[PDB]
Amino acid sequence: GKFYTSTEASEITHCSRRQLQYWREKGVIVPTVNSSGKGRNVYYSKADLLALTVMEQLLSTGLNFDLCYAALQTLRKQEPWLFDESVPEEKMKRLMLLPTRSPEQPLQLAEFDKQAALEALCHGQTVIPFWSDRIHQQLRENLKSFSS
Amino acid sequence: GKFYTSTEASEITHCSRRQLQYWREKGVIVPTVNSSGKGRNVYYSKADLLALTVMEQLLSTGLNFDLCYAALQTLRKQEPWLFDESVPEEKMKRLMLLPTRSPEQPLQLAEFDKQAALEALCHGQTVIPFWSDRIHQQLRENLKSFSS
Ligand SMILES: Nc1ncnc2c1ncn2[C@@H]1O[C@H](COP(=O)(O)OP(=O)(O)OP(=O)(O)O)[C@@H](O)[C@H]1O
Ligand SMILES: Nc1ncnc2c1ncn2[C@@H]1O[C@H](COP(=O)(O)OP(=O)(O)OP(=O)(O)O)[C@@H](O)[C@H]1O
Description:
Shape of chain A: globular
Helix content of chain A: 40-55%
Assembly: dimeric
Bound molecules: adenosine-5'-triphosphate
Strand content of chain A: 5-15%
Entry title: Crystal structure of CvkR, a novel MerR-type transcriptional regulator
PDB class: transcription
Largest sheet of chain A: 3 strands, antiparallel
Number of domains of chain A: 1
Keywords: MerR-type transcriptional regulator, transcription
Oligomer: homodimer
CATH architecture of chain A: Orthogonal Bundle
Chains A, B: Alr3614 protein
């Protein structure tokens, strides 16, 4: 479909070029590449831009990088409807991330619901709301703006 | 009062020696030191052990290091009763940390209350409960255990 350069991706998703390069180096995001040269050689898909938008949003919660990476991996594997363009934003489900003390399973991801979320807080557990619709709305609005 | 070596501090608070060295290097915690030599030369106070316990607990929430450091600085300045041994644990107030998107003020700290905390979650805001009493209880129990 539509492909975007690194500077275009950086400006659309409000990730710095330095962040994109680091996330490429670490395998967080895998844009399409070709041999090195003076011309453009790295291109992000719309799904990559969505992954960038997720990563920037997770990092804005204060969550450490390793857990943001783990969250993005879990979202892409377990919640692929987030990246599908199948579900219109009105029907996407809001989620919540619950960090744990288990190195093997360091992050729980669940559907958001107020009763369970408030119960977790009253037990002393950190809750990180993750509004799937806002994610997709934010990229869509950055992109509609991007042309103009 | 009582002073503890780095290995004693590491084992009491379940921070690795590598973490203590890094937090010393960065100024997170400032144990008492003297000139270098073959003998012991770094000593943690009970208040330092409390600061270590806070730092290990904040890092367990998933909060990134810079914000844990900022949280510890804000707690020591704004909530010195946490480190005073004034308030018995039964009267210490539970808190909550709310990470923000402002670089100048990247973290809000507030008294915990369920109504406000649930309202923040429903608005999409991350909430990190911080149980002051559990902090002081945990070190006290690690220390009562430590002798035996
Ligand atoms: N919100 C909080 N603020 C401060 N300390 C906390 C908070 N939540 C948990 N802790 C501390 O984290 C440690 C582990 O807590 P948690 O209840 O998850 O496990 P635990 O009860 O030690 O596990 P186990 O059931 O295996 O003994 C405990 O020492 C607890 O005091
Ligand atoms: N829980 C969440 N999940 C996903 N995206 C979120 C969540 N909370 C906030 N955002 C996104 O973070 C960005 C900033 O949110 P916030 O409401 O704090 O500020 P804002 O409304 O952009 O600020 P202003 O009032 O200055 O325009 C928004 O794009 C919003 O969509």
